[PDB]
């Protein structure tokens with residue numbers, strides 16, 4: 004069950020990366036965008052590898 | 055890209071013909087008579103036709119010409135449609151009979167596969183006689199090549215298209231998609247049945263799932279990526295090639311691995 | 316090495332509004348670097364390598380056949396769906412750069428489908444017996 008909790012953590016991390024794609028610049032400044040463009044990579048890859 | 059995928063499709067049709075020859079070489083002399091060999095070899099010839107339909111997809115004004123174009127468009131349409139029909143209707147017939155006889159006689163199988171193929175051919179023919187396919191050119195924005203030759207290039211791209219596509223094509227895609235989803239559902243429902251009259255319903259279920267997934271993926275992508283010739287051609291070609299390769303192997307290599315002891 | 320900075324591109328100045336007398340130049344914000352393909356390729360290479368070793372070891376354990384923890388069918392199906400859908404998504408997203416809505420819809424549906432499948436095919440077979 005602990006590995007199952009790990010894979011559910013990975014799945015919810017990957018779900019959390021949906022929002023960080025639609026943010027384009029009409030909702031975000033010009034400096035937060037460049038950090039979102041790497042936090043979404045972080046989140047997606049670690050969620051997938053964890054699961 | 056064109057010649058590489060054509061070599062791939064040629065090897066595919068070679069393997070399909072070899073395999074159909076093998077399966078008919080042991081028609082009833084062994085247990086192969088259990089798993090209906092007519093449905094399996096109909097599937098094999100359907101995959102062969104669908105793989106042969108790759109060459110008309112790659113032939114454009116670089117090779118053929120303007121007057122030989124409505125033959126290439128017709129080859130595309132008829133080969134692809136009839137090949138998909140003959141290579142999916144057999145598996146759908148197999149799985150549908152496996153379903154409905156467990157919730158029989160071998161002539162109803164041929165009756166219903168003929169019904170499916172006839173429906174597909176009749177609807178494709180009525181579409182083609184109402185609004186036939188003809189050559190159409192679509193133009194891009196002007197650009198400037200700077201080889202110091204001092205000329206402006208107007209890049210153009212031509213493709214087979216009827217008067218009002220994206221409507222008849224939409225109807226064909228939706229009808230085939232609902233058929234594919236019914237195939238997936240029936241294959242999932244009857245994975246536990248262990249009929250002895252039909253031997254390999256689990257293999258046709260796996261092949262149906264694969265073909266349906268790849269087709270439902272590559273059907274709208276090709277419509278979206280239409281204005282890029284390489285992307286659309288590579289997507290359609292690789293979908294056909296991989297689906298046919300995998301359905302051939304998963305449908306036949308267990309038979310020749312069990313028969314060879 | 317490549318901090319993946321922000322770059323903006325512009326094109327097609329001539330488009331016009333409903334008649335308000337403006338030349339609306341549309342521009343689009345992106346996140347590229349010098350060599351995006353190399354880094355994305357090595358990332359996908361590592362992920363595909365672990366995927367391949369997982370599929371190998373799941374096939375090697377196919378014949379345990381205990382009704383409680385065999386579950387190699389689910390590993391196979393999930394890795395197949397994930398592999399094919401992520402390859403298609405990574406190919407399509409690069410080919411639709413100049414269409415933000417289509418790119419976003421494609422990648423969002425890919426992520427949603429892959430994650431929900433790799434979750435259901437692991438958790439729903441348990442909770443269907445406990446009833």
Ligand SMILES: CC(C)(C)c1cc(C(C)(C)C)c2c(c1)[C@@](O)(C(F)(F)F)C(=O)O2
Pocket residue numbers: 238241242245256259260261262263388389392
């Ligand atoms: C190939 C086919 C017969 C169509 C099939 C389809 C499914 C779906 C539930 C995803 C529809 C499926 C299986 C087989 C599995 O037996 C397994 F093998 F993947 F595990 C399973 O439980 O799920």
